[PDB]
Amino acid sequence: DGDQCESNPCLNGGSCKDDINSYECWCPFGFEGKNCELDVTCNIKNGRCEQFCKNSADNKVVCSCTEGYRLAENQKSCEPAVPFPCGRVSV
Amino acid sequence: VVGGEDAKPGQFPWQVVLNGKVDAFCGGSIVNEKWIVTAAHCVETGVKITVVAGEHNIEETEHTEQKRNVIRIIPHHNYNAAINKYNHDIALLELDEPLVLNSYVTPICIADKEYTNIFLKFGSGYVSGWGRVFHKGRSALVLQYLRVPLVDRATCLRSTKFTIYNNMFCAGFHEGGRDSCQGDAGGPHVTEVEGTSFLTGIISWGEECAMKGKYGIYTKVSRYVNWIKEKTKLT
Numbered sequence: 001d002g003d004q005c006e007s008n009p010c011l012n013g014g015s016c017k018d019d020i021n022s023y024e025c026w027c028p029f030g031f032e033g034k035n036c037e038l039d040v041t042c043n044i045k046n047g048r049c050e051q052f053c054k055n056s057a058d059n060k061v062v063c064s065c066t067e068g069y070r071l072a073e074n075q076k077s078c079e080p081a082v083p084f085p086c087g088r089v090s091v
Numbered sequence: 092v093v094g095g096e097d098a099k100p101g102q103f104p105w106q107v108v109l110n111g112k113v114d115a116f117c118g119g120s121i122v123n124e125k126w127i128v129t130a131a132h133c134v135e136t137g138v139k140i141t142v143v144a145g146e147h148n149i150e151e152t153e154h155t156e157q158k159r160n161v162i163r164i165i166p167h168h169n170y171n172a173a174i175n176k177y178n179h180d181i182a183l184l185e186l187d188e189p190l191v192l193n194s195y196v197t198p199i200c201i202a203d204k205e206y207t208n209i210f211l212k213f214g215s216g217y218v219s220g221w222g223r224v225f226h227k228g229r230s231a232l233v234l235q236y237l238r239v240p241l242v243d244r245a246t247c248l249r250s251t252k253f254t255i256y257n258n259m260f261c262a263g264f265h266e267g268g269r270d271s272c273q274g275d276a277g278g279p280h281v282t283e284v285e286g287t288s289f290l291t292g293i294i295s296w297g298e299e300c301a302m303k304g305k306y307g308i309y310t311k312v313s314r315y316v317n318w319i320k321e322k323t324k325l326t
């Protein structure tokens with residue numbers, strides 16, 4: 001059906017993957033939307049933060065976690081930092 | 092709790108029961124190894140409180156229970172029963188020896204003010220306790236839980252006594268029958284977000300169960316988070 005990525009439809013350095021009759025834009029950190037046109041922000045899906053989102057100086061999101069969790073390497077997820085983190089059922 | 096069901100062991104591992112001259116007169120929630128949050132109206136001057144974590148059936152020995160004495164009681168500084176029994180209805184209890192955290196004994200998460208409120212507004216919380224299983228009925232032997240929907244402010248104020256909406260919220264069903272009861276006060280109103288539970292309220296008064304109103308009233312935890320964090324900090 002042809003390569004839909006030939007016309008370079010991804011903004012902001014997104015990587016274009018050709019599917020059947022469509023493309024995906026895999027966005028670099030900080031961008032989202034079908035064409036990587038959006039800046040990740042706290043008011044769209046909580047800035048993709050698993051727990052808490054804030055705007056930092058330099059107007060980028062920063063994610064954070066409650067006590068007993070640490071921010072994962074992906075800078076979004078909150079992973080246990082202690083054996084029995086708050087609010088989880090484990091039986 | 093009226094109209095709920097039996098918790099399974101370890102389903103609500105942040106839940107504690109408060110025991111005095113009578114057992115299970117109130118509940119509470121584990122903030123951390125040393126601290127419980129409960130309702131101020133549960134913790135009068137002169138009376139001893141014993142806390143039990145890891146409790147399931149209050150008349151059987153499950154080998155999960157951890158009993159602790161209370162060495163310090165901090166009612167919220169605005170609490171005054173003479174003006175309103177259920178306003179600023181929140182208190183912290185310090186335990187004599189730390190709880191040993193495990194699958195049966197686990198703290199509830201407490202988010203900041205903004206996120207606590209967001210979570211509340213998702214509109215459905217879990218309430219739990221060993222309170223009466225119907226009005227004037229027997230105390231529960233096995234921990235009960237119930238899902239209660241958030242009730243809008245206007246509806247809350249029309250149908251319930253002593254409500255100060257800044258500090259409190261209503262929850263329950265328009266058709267009634269399902270509420271916290273005497274013995275549940277001080278226990279948790281909790282909101283689960285993608286497998287992690289957050290404290291959104293303190294059970295204050297089950298007006299429906301008490302036949303004084305159509306809904307349960309709850310202390311809004313969002314208003315008290317900084318105080319909780321400050322007082323209970325272990326470091």
Ligand SMILES: *[C@@H]1O[C@@H](C)[C@@H](O)[C@@H](O)[C@@H]1O
Nearest residue numbers: 013014015016026027028
């Ligand atoms: C393609 O993938 C995306 C996610 C970015 O890492 C780009 O830099 C890369 O070329």
Ligand SMILES: [Ca+2]
Nearest residue numbers: 002019020021
């Ligand atoms: Ca194609």
Ligand SMILES: [Ca+2]
Nearest residue numbers: 148151152153
């Ligand atoms: Ca027991």
